[PDB]
Amino acid sequence: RPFRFGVNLVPTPGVSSWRETCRTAEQSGYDVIAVPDHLGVHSPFIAMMAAAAVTERVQLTTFVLNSAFWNPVLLARDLLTAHELTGGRVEAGLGTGYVRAEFETAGLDWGTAGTRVTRLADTLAALRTLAVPTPLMVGGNGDRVLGLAAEHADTVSFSGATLRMITAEAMDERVAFFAERAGERDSQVERNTLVQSVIATDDRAATAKAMRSRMPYLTAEQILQLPTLLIGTPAQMAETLLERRERFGFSYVCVQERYLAAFAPVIGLL
């Protein structure tokens, strides 16, 4: 699958730079602007409309919605509106939610991991029944969540950092698990992951050795294979992404806002 690159931007209350930041993302060659779903962050679909008004080619995605925050019928209303009024530029990533304090602040039941995944399941089923036109992404590494992505999603997002970094070998197993559940639909589902850190260096080997301090359970060799880290020159990072597309199927790669400019040269090469 051809590469698509995203940057996860945080639209921040009290800061006046949103439209400028979105323009910088598009001008730097990103294909997707991704926004999160948190209390204390701007509301995601409203922020995405503001981004759409100042950009022309990028897709806009949630990354990912906290399913506890959304009534499925009203979310379907939001998605149809975002789709029609942007001319088809909106995608919806969904997940279970994970910050308990936000559940408590909003007056919502934290429940159990099982009830939070069931809410995601119920919402995905309802959105598909309502035939929402926005492509749907499902994120998260749990068995049930990957099973729901296999059933319902256009894009599956694998998490590489739980932060505890997951090894390439554990990611091999998660991708294979997803593929087995997807069965005949596997070829129809785009695979995404978020790179947490983009570390520009002329000595990737010395860099990985120093990073063992923050990841003691890993060898330097494992660190250089972590899907959530990109280390080296732009050319080395492009080669790494080519290898990881072959290994994991990852063609939709997102980075964090702080690394927007660091990663842009890799887009130039790929």
Tokens of 102: 């936000």
Hey, is 192 helix, strand or coil?
strand
Task: Using the structure block, give the residue that is written with the tokens 């070829």.
Answer: 187
Resolution in A: 1.6
Class at the top of the CATH hierarchy for domain 4-269: alpha beta
CA–CA distance, 143 with 152 (Å, rounded to integer)? 14
Q: How far apart are CA 249 and CA 193, in angstroms?
A: 10
157 bridge partner residues: 139, 192
User: In angstroms, rounded to a whole number, what is the distance separating the alpha carbons of residues 152 and 117?
Assistant: 14
Asked if residue 22 lies in contact with residue 9, where contact means CB atoms within 8 angstroms, the answer is yes
Experimental technique of record: X-ray
Give residue 208's identity as a one-letter amino acid code. Answer: A
Q: Can you spell out the DSSP letters for 229-247?
A: EEEE-HHHHHHHHHHHHHH
Query: What is the number of other CB atoms lying within 10 angstroms of the CB of residue 156?
Result: 29
Domain boundaries, the chain: 4-269
Instruction: Assess contact for 60 and 52: CB atoms under 8 A.
Output: yes
Closest by Cα among 48, 6, 61, 37 to 198: 6
- Phi/psi zone of residue 39: left (φ > 0), alpha (ψ -120 to 50 degrees), beta? beta
Distance CA 161, CA 100 (A): 18
AA letter at 119: R
The rounded Cα 156 to chain-centroid distance in angstroms is 9
